Amino acid sequence: NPTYFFTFGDSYSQTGFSASGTQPSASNPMGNPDLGIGTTTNGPNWIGYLTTTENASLVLSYNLAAGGATIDNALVPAYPGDLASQFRLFEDVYADKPASAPWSAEDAVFGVWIGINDIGNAYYSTDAETYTPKLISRLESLVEEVYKNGGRKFLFLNVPPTSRSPLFLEQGEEVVKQHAEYLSVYNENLEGMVDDFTKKKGDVTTVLYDSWSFMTKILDDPTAYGFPDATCINDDGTSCIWWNNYHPGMKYHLLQAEDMKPKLRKLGGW
């Protein structure tokens, strides 16, 4: 019996999935495009690995993540396909449980990885303590739409240390520090929201995955993971942590998915 894994996020999660493309099936769990296409990793990303390599049973991936996305263009704007628009695509196509995706509370998992671009664009112009609650409140209201549709199993990934990507390192240590301090406040408020939502609903199963600590461990000791250093870039996706100056490669994504597997057992597909 399948797990319907609906995901929402940005370039760390995009795969190029179209709602008018081939839809997920047991013979083709990613639907479209082929596994390993459309990512920022040179191969599968964490969603492709969770769906096809770390899965304990059948997982069907409906991946709505879009490059450059922020939470809501009424807050920090960037690209048309913000997280709000991804929830709107879900509402239009899958929320009503069509025969192509006949999900239920017991077998649907909703995964969200967002915040990299909100922080990347607003860390120097806004006050973290008072602005990040507005971003997190909007994320919560989007999650509530899916809850109202009947969703009950949720996966949230906190924001990883993009402060230490080559793109940010090149901007100088003070900028790395300002970005990192802002990001820490965002991640604390995300954790608080997930805990409050879990307690208040009482009938949900949630996982908050601390990607920040995992990636930080690798950046702090890269050779223990088979990477020569924490800063090199290689678009093969495996020689270095970084596939380009702002995105990690497929080797990192596989290590993350392997780290996530045990923490996702309670969600049903792992």
Side-chain angles (χ1 to χ4, degrees):
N1 286 285
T3 291
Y4 300 88
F5 188 30
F6 296 98
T7 48
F8 309 81
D10 57 35
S11 59
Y12 276 38
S13 298
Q14 65 184 90
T15 56
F17 174 91
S18 170
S20 272
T22 303
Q23 289 301 284
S25 68
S27 69
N28 174 25
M30 310 293 308
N32 70 92
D34 288 353
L35 176 64
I37 300 285
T39 68
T40 56
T41 74
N42 200 47
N45 69 6
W46 68 281
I47 298 169
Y49 287 126
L50 284 184
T51 298
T52 68
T53 311
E54 309 304 307
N55 61 304
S57 48
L58 179 63
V59 174
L60 300 178
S61 166
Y62 305 79
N63 182 26
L64 309 186
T70 57
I71 292 165
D72 189 316
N73 287 320
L75 294 171
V76 182
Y79 290 94
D82 60 359
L83 196 77
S85 82
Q86 301 169 30
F87 277 77
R88 178 63 171 168
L89 173 58
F90 177 81
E91 286 310 305
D92 287 338
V93 178
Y94 302 111
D96 286 348
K97 307 160 169 190
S100 77
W103 65 270
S104 73
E106 292 77 11
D107 57 29
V109 173
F110 300 89
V112 179
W113 199 6
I114 200 70
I116 287 168
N117 299 313
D118 308 72
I119 294 157
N121 289 122
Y123 75 91
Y124 66 91
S125 60
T126 60
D127 177 62
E129 294 296 344
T130 80
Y131 197 72
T132 65
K134 294 179 189 186
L135 295 170
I136 294 302
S137 181
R138 180 61 181 128
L139 171 57
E140 199 280 338
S141 301
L142 291 170
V143 166
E144 291 279 2
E145 298 182 9
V146 166
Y147 186 91
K148 184 166 181 303
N149 295 322
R152 292 295 184 273
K153 301 206 261 184
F154 299 87
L155 166 63
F156 299 89
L157 287 74
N158 73 4
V159 179
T162 57
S163 322
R164 298 170 64 182
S165 63
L167 181 50
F168 273 92
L169 294 175
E170 175 298 317
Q171 292 183 58
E173 292 182 41
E174 180 59 62
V175 164
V176 171
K177 169 185 171 81
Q178 201 185 20
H179 180 279
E181 293 190 351
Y182 191 103
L183 185 155
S184 187
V185 176
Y186 179 95
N187 278 349
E188 281 179 320
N189 287 329
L190 175 66
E191 179 175 67
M193 182 278 289
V194 172
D195 282 350
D196 291 349
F197 172 83
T198 302
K199 183 182 163 93
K200 169 70 163 303
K201 295 313 198 177
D203 65 344
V204 298
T205 303
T206 64
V207 170
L208 181 57
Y209 177 69
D210 182 5
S211 81
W212 191 93
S213 295
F214 181 71
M215 185 183 277
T216 291
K217 260 206 316 193
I218 300 185
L219 295 171
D220 285 351
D221 191 6
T223 65
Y225 301 86
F227 297 112
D229 60 52
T231 61
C232 72
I233 297 162
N234 193 321
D235 70 0
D236 69 17
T238 63
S239 289
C240 291
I241 295 170
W242 304 103
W243 170 79
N244 74 358
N245 65 7
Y246 201 33
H247 304 85
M250 51 181 274
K251 176 166 183 197
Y252 170 78
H253 279 254
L254 173 58
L255 286 170
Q256 186 184 292
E258 285 172 343
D259 188 65
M260 288 176 81
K261 181 180 168 64
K263 297 154 172 194
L264 302 190
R265 290 176 298 223
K266 59 193 264 184
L267 294 175
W270 298 280

